[PDB]
């Protein structure tokens, strides 16, 4: 009846929260809903497709590049950006690098208003005289949308890719029986939220609670159809 909700975070990635004490059973009522929404909602960057020169098939190898096509696709999925203005819900990032080089997420050519929050990342290695050019597509949304789902092709040979939407990675809360004075039936519910960096766990959770009470207030206007 007097919750002490606190938070222990680190950087923009990891964060923890403790709502203690509480009534028996409520910790669960809080745990799943917050969790289910934190990974199925919460808008974010999520790169979608990519195009590449000389590379038509998503299989056929690209000479001059150490890694194959797929490896690059993966590294591209791990990458994360952000849109500064709410107006742009879709942009296009580009890049070109020749000769021997260490290609990175930083080496990526700029965009209108897009900041790559993940500058240091391995994308691909280029051998002697390696010709590489690619134009990636980045939209916004929520949840998970595999290559099967979105059929995006902004070019002739473009290659749809898994969309990592939810900036969050894994939550997995835990409720433990806590004791204060009398009545050991109490909830010490603790939540550990992981974020890619788009938003710190604090902001993510605080967004979730909004997506919660908002949905809750949806019960206003009864309509009596009595059977």
């Amino acid at each position: 009846k007097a919750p002490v909700f606190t938070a222990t975070t680190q950087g923009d990635h990891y964060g923890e929260f403790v709502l203690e004490p509480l009534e028996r059973g409520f910790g669960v009522t809080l745990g799943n809903p917050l969790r289910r929404i934190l990974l199925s909602s919460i808008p974010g960057t999520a790169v979608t497709s990519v195009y590449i020169e000389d590379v038509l098939h998503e299989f056929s190898t690209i000479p001059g590049v150490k890694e194959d096509v797929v490896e690059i696709i993966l590294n591209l999925k791990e990458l994360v950006v952000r849109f500064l203005d709410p107006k742009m819900a879709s942009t296009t990032l580009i890049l070109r690098a020749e000769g021997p080089k260490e290609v990175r997420a930083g080496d990526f050519t700029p965009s209108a208003d897009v900041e790559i929050m993940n500058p240091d990342l391995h994308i691909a290695t280029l051998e002697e005289g390696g010709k590489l050019y690619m134009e990636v597509r980045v939209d916004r949304g929520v949840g998970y949308v595999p290559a099967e789902r979105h059929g995006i092709k902004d070019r002739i040979n473009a290659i749809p890719v898994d969309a990592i939407f939810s900036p969050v990675r894994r939550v997995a809360f835990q409720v433990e029986d806590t004791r204060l004075g009398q009545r050991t039936d109490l909830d010490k519910l603790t939540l550990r939220i992981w974020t890619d960096g788009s938003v710190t766990p604090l902001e993510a959770l605080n967004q979730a609670v909004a997506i919660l009470k908002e949905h809750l207030n949806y019960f206003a206007n009864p309509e009596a159809s009595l059977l």
Binding site: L39, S40, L74, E78, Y144, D162, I164
Partner: protein, 315 residues
Amino acid sequence: YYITQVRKEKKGAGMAFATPEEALAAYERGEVALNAPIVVAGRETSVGRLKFVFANPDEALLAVAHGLLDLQDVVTVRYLGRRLETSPGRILFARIVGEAVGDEKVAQELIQMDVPQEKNSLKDLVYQAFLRLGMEKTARLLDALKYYGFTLSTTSGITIGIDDAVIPEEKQRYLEEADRKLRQIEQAYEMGFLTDRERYDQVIQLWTETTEKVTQAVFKNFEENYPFNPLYVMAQSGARGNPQQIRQLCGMRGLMQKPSGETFEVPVRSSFREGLTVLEYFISSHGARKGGADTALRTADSGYLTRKLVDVAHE
């Protein structure tokens, strides 16, 4: 175990495709199963190892736990800087272990990433931990496998119905064959070939093998047809049960033993799920209630020995 259990369907029939596209369309059309070992181009891979490409574990969980994949399926993952082909739960294991020890680099280094984790593997892992790592480290690891293992067991919710052990259709067959073989041994008793004792032996051995022609079929049935069956898995992983026990709970029970100690000459057939006739039960109860005192009494002689050994090697 249940989580690390690698599932493989048979529906796909393992056909051959030139490009991933035919296989794909096949999956959607229901012409091929998910984890079915098919063939694309010059290589072979499940529909899962293609339709699911994970550049990291968190991606795997985020996709599966979200409900787009099954906890145990053959997929392609990038876990610990390497491209493997495994299951989400499979990764989860090494993950929990490492998160308990604190560096997953040594964790996955000493664990089996190939086959599901049963009693043995778990044991070995604990040992290797207490030896390479340290005491508290292992206390942690143990508790980890406790909490997560338990919760997972609750997840699966595996239960036991009457139909959770089905007797092979080879029971009626392979046994009705012995029903003829007995009649043959009898014809030999009346033809002078066989006497009264060698007949007893021919019958006792006929049933000794007849117990095998069925007991084998039991396990071959749980393996060929229902690998996810609760009884089978429980006894397999080492959760509960033993082979002879599952034998009497599915296949034929087998010949009993007269209280005089000479084994009986008549077959019981029916299993516990089938149900025993009055006769079968009473006939069995002899050596059955015999075993009770056989153990219960000997528990005393245990103390008898113990105390003495203590009174010799004490100094």
